[PDB]
Amino acid sequence: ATFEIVNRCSYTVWAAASKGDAALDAGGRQLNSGESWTINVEPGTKGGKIWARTDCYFDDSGSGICKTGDCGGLLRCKRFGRPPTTLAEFSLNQYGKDYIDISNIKGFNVPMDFSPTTRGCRGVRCAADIVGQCPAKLKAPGGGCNDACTVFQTSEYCCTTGKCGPTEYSRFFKRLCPDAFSYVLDKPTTVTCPGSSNYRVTFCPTA
């Protein structure tokens, strides 16, 4: 499947793509404002994620640090990134269907639209000013708005027992972005697309 990753933000981001134990395609790249990066994701990929990283510094070896979404100090990510990270999530060719969603379960750093470029399903978006409105206790100094599990490490926020409800913190994310997961057991906002669809992820879709 082809994913086109587009940075419409006015600032540089470092895109990342991983399935947790491996990079997808090159795994990461710098995207200046307006740049597009096309990657190929193998059919059948389960549990892939795409995210943006902000305020990164990398040397010529591809090693460094980012203030949001850092994946072990690498430009080319092999593992998932450190919160806060708005997440585009997908599992492809699962019994004939693709499944896509956006998630705030690991916080929010950059607004995003995640849409098919082929026919047969709708896209999803979280483009509200979550960072600007973020509750004081969830604000991340490096930038972004953390989720409550990352901050407080309780069974209720992390849903550790498999039983948990919405919270004051999850409802904040849900109020601003109803179409994104706000906690582990949120009513699913997953979109079902035809198997082998292609996609575009746009950072800062309105801004």
UniProtKB/Swiss-Prot annotation:
* InterPro entries (UniProt xref): Osmotin/thaumatin-like_sf, Thaumatin, Thaumatin_CS
Question: Taxonomy-wise, where does this protein's organism fall, top ranks first?
Answer: Eukaryota, Viridiplantae, Streptophyta, Embryophyta, Tracheophyta
> Keywords, A to Z?
Cytoplasmic vesicle, Disulfide bond, Signal, Taste-modifying protein
Name of one Pfam family that matches: Thaumatin
Q: Does the keyword Signal apply?
A: yes
Q: Which GO terms describe its cellular component?
A: cytoplasmic vesicle
In terms of PANTHER family, this protein maps to: OS03G0233200 PROTEIN (PTHR31048)
> What is the source species?
Thaumatococcus daniellii (Katemfe)
Disulfide partners: 9-204, 56-66, 71-77, 121-193, 126-177, 134-145, 149-158, 159-164
**What is this protein's record name?**
Thaumatin I
- Function of this protein? Taste-modifying protein; intensely sweet-tasting. It is 100000 times sweeter than sucrose on a molar basis.
PROSITE patterns cross-referenced by the UniProt entry? THAUMATIN_1, THAUMATIN_2
Q: Which family does it belong to?
A: Belongs to the thaumatin family.
